[PDB]
Design a protein around this nucleic acid. Sequence first.
RNA 1: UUGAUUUGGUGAGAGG
Lengths: 50, 50, 228, 230, 51, 100, 83, 35
Amino acid sequence: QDVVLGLYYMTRDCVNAKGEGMVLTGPKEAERLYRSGLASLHARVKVRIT
Amino acid sequence: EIKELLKLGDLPTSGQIRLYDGRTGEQFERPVTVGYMYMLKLNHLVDDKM
Amino acid sequence: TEFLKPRLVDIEQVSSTHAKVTLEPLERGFGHTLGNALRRILLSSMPGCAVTEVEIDGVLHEYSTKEGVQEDILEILLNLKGLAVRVQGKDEVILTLNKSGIGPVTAADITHDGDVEIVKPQHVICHLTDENASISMRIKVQRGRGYVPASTRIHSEEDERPIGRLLVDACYSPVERIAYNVEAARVEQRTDLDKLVIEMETNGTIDPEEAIRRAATILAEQLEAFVD
Amino acid sequence: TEFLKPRLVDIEQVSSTHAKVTLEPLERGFGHTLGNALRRILLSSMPGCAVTEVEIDGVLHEYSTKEGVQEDILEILLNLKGLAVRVQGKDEVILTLNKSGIGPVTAADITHDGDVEIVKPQHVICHLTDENASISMRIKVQRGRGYVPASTRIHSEEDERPIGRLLVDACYSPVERIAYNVEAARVEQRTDLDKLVIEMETNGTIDPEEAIRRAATILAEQLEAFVDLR
Amino acid sequence: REEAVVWDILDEVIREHPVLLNRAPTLHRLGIQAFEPVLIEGKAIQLHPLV
Amino acid sequence: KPLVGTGMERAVAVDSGVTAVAKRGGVVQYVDASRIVIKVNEDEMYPGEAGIDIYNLTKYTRSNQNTCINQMPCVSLGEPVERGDVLADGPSTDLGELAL
Amino acid sequence: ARVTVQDAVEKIGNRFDLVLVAARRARQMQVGGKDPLVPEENDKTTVIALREIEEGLINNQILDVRERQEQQEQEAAELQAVT
Amino acid sequence: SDVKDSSLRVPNGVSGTVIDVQVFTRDGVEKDKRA
RNA sequence: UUGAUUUGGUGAGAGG
């Protein structure tokens, strides 16, 4: 119950947030942009995943 | 009347205050509900069951 | 009124760019203090240098396309951002790379001065389809601290740069990921203590313990004023 | 490395207990780091003196009652657990409270020694109603940190004490509430600097610049394990 | 008496020794599962949430 | 004292005999270490049997569920009380209300 | 250390015979006389047994071969000590 | 030797303070001369 | 060879 709420709030999206439509060189700096305070947890973004 | 009484006190009308985290010092997104609930201690104590 | 000093018990060196500093034991609710302080300093305050601006011929903005390459210029921007360079003496060095022929272009192909060097020469830049394709980019390297992205970079700039200059996110701080846990250790009477497990993965140009020691002495010299 | 160093520039006392303090200048991003670290340390690990053993004459256990008073003995032990004492030289002192006559027993009636200072002269303890009633308690004030309770201090105590000494729980920490704010600093040539406005709320016994100095020394000596060894 | 040396003995008898946790109305076989103990300051069984 | 109550706390805390509801109104003498002593106003006071009411407080004792039933005086010395008013707060009561 | 026994179940494919083979081995290490075929990380005889199973050097056939070898060693010891 | 220990003790796990001792014992309980 | 009694059974109430 708690963990599906944490995931459903995490992997979602909104039509404008901090860092809308910026491009990221990996998931590591995705978490680094979430922690430093430069993007939001749900902000649509092109990443490069492997 | 709950909203009007929350306006007599200087509290926010929604009943919800933004709360920071004691661990990380940074704000919880999406403001949370804080209030006073009258909580009771029932007589099912754990060092009568262990 | 005496506090528990720890011993650094483990550096499980997984790779040359990986570490796990198991650390025990601390006072109750001190692992989160040390871990969060080091994490915020290592994310947004640690000094270092990387690529900020690049001028490429054949392009006019970030959504054009040069010939002879499989990848596009967003991919060359991203693979440029992934490059880890170190500058010793100066702090604003412009570099230029030229490549022609059938084959990929790597980091060792660049023209370097005496003050700069590449920590990963086999890090790929792009690939080239045509032997007649002659790629050219003027790679500028500043030096700052932490992280500044191209979005607020283009919001903060106002001077009209010449057409062909490309902005990239400036990964100044050399760490890529730091994330810890706090576990629970035991001194023989009190079970309330807690053990730190700091994980760290960086790029080249540094050794994770050197980054940890740098952040720790940054915070100690920051707090050096009003102590006894 | 273009960093700076902060100083305690202005220390305003809003009252004797609730008192703010500035910090200036902090670097960019450091404000929430130092504020949260000083919050965690200043709430967990400060030294303050508190009541530990209460010795009333003619009272065996704490669940009895006494002649001539209002509050019962558990009420007296709670009102003594709230006490705020500030010793200077020793680390373990014994006070004395003796009073007869109809009227309330303030904290200002304790026959103080020279190096103890009771900073709440309106702290009520008892309500003596009979004029032939008396009360003579002998308090014991240790000094430590954190929270050490009666159950753990039931066998921990080594010095074999005699029977008849009521054990009061020890709330040692004199900091009760602390909030920090990261404003925008007014620097005449820099705009990317900030100030830290720590708003303490003490027990009245601790001096705020001394508390901040001790918390800073605690943080520096904890980080020396990172600095020196690896 | 519970002296200071039997807790190291206890952490050396626990280590790789599973226990059967069992909720009182066991209906199917997933209501008896074996765990490894981790010692708790407390008086309550801490049980992993997914389980 | 429940901040959000229904107002039926008063009737339950009085009507269950765990609080020492005053039988005859008046003032107070308040020896109280042992018993509340209430001087009675003259209108509620009988002609013979001059009379002042001495309430017994039941201190720390065993309930049927091993909890502690205990009464504490909630009136001071020299303070007017009326008939039907409460004097000693029982277990789980706060000034005549019901504080579970 | 040990979390799952899945490789040991792979190499003795019955999942009910794993318990019997590792119990025979852990009784050879507990009472037992014998010393393990694997480095021990302060694991108990259960985890050392299953950890021997996972790397494919103890099964039912190896234990019966070793017990025939010990029976032949006791036979040769009895014959060479008496005669 | 054949003597034993039925002496009512405190149950396992509980603490506390003896708040009251009642004794309407077999007309004779007095130990020394306390009765 | 160094020590002891509820389970038994009923009724009532409670927890998950």
